[PDB]
Amino acid sequence: ALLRILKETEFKKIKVLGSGAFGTVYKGLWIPEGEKVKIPVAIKELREATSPKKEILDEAYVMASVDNPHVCRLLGICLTSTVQLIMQLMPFGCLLDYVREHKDNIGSQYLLNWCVQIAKGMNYLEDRRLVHRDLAARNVLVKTPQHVKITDFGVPIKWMALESILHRIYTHQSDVWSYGVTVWELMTFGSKPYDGIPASEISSILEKGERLPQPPICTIDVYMIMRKCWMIDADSRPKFRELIIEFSKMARDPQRYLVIQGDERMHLSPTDSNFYRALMDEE
Numbered sequence: 001a002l003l004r005i006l007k008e009t010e011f012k013k014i015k016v017l018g019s020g021a022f023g024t025v026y027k028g029l030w031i032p033e034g035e036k037v038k039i040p041v042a043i044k045e046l047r048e049a050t051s052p053k054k055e056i057l058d059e060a061y062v063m064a065s066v067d068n069p070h071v072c073r074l075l076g077i078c079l080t081s082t083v084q085l086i087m088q089l090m091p092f093g094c095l096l097d098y099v100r101e102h103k104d105n106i107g108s109q110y111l112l113n114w115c116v117q118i119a120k121g122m123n124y125l126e127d128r129r130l131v132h133r134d135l136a137a138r139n140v141l142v143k144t145p146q147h148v149k150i151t152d153f154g155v156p157i158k159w160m161a162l163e164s165i166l167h168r169i170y171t172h173q174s175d176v177w178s179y180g181v182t183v184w185e186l187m188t189f190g191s192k193p194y195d196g197i198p199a200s201e202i203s204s205i206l207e208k209g210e211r212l213p214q215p216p217i218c219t220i221d222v223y224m225i226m227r228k229c230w231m232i233d234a235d236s237r238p239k240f241r242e243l244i245i246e247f248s249k250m251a252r253d254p255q256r257y258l259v260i261q262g263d264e265r266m267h268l269s270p271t272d273s274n275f276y277r278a279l280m281d282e283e
């Protein structure tokens with residue numbers, strides 16, 4: 001009952017934001033009936049063509065029902081030939097591009113905190129018994145640089161856990177794998193995982209014990225957590241709840257666990273967030 005159902009005439013596509021696996025995502029404008037305002041929105045038109053599924057809507061009723069600062073919520077759904085999902089527009093985009101776009105202007109406090117946040121979001125999804133199945137930096141959106149949120153829960157071979165490849169098994173402990181790649185992405189500043197290895201050969205390099213490398217900025221504490229996320233015996237992997245504590249502990253002394261050049265001139269200020277939070281993130 002938390003899922004507004006929109007008519008086709010009260011919103012319009014305005015700019016393409018990118019496509020991916022399941023759909024295309026536009027910047028749309030919501031025009032409330034009777035009103036002369038245009039409220040911006042993010043729409044994701046599916047890539048299929050719904051035919052009285054049911055299935056979807058029954059899932060959108062869950063997605064729309066996730067109250068947590070760090071996980072994004074489906075806001076509405078227009079059931080059209082191509083179904084349209086509507087959610088809050090995030091101008092900064094996703095954390096992938098953001099770390100890319102700011103390659104040499106990201107302190108250790110940010111990175112360690114993003115890691116904290118994605119964990120908290122993930123942990124909430126775990127507690128809600130939902131498996132993300134597609135956690136990656138491109139699916140972490142930036143509300144403000146200080147607040148990131150997971151989107152798109154509910155084939156990224158290069159992020160999947162070995163067992164999800166070999167046996168299509170998506171348990172929570174495999175999302176902890178994807179979490180491991182995501183942090184890797186964060187610390188490598190947008191690098192591409194296994195860049196060079198065809199995505200038909202990952203199941204083999206993984207079974208040989210091959211794993212992504214230690215990013216430059218990473219220490220032994222920050223890279224050993226990652227490695228655990230990528231262990232074969234699924235249950236030998238950290239629980240999301242234990243990554244919050246570890247990463248939260250490291251975030252309290254970041255220049256000690258991340259070694260970044262000029263880290264001395266790049267940090268979080270109360271005036272600059274009290275300004276950010278009124279204009280954008282009013283939690």
Ligand SMILES: Nc1ncnc2c1ncn2[C@@H]1O[C@H](COP(=O)(O)OP(=O)(O)NP(=O)(O)O)[C@@H](O)[C@H]1O
Nearest residue numbers: 017018019020021022025042088089090094138139
């Ligand atoms: N709610 C949103 N607000 C703003 N930008 C968004 C929003 N949702 C998605 N985007 C952006 O639109 C791009 C395309 O969306 P999408 O195809 O769903 O993401 P993707 O990660 O690249 N594909 P996928 O591998 O399936 O998760 C994303 O990478 C984001 O940068």
Ligand SMILES: O=C(Nc1nccs1)[C@@H](c1ccccc1)N1C(=O)c2ccccc2C1=O
Nearest residue numbers: 042043044060063072073074085087152153
């Ligand atoms: O629409 C989605 N993301 C968007 N990006 C730009 C505008 S909406 C995501 C999603 C958004 C927020 C939280 C969780 C998931 N989503 C659904 O809820 C959903 C339901 C049923 C079928 C397919 C999907 C799907 O892909």
Ligand SMILES: [Mg+2]
Nearest residue numbers: 138139151152
């Ligand atoms: Mg996505």
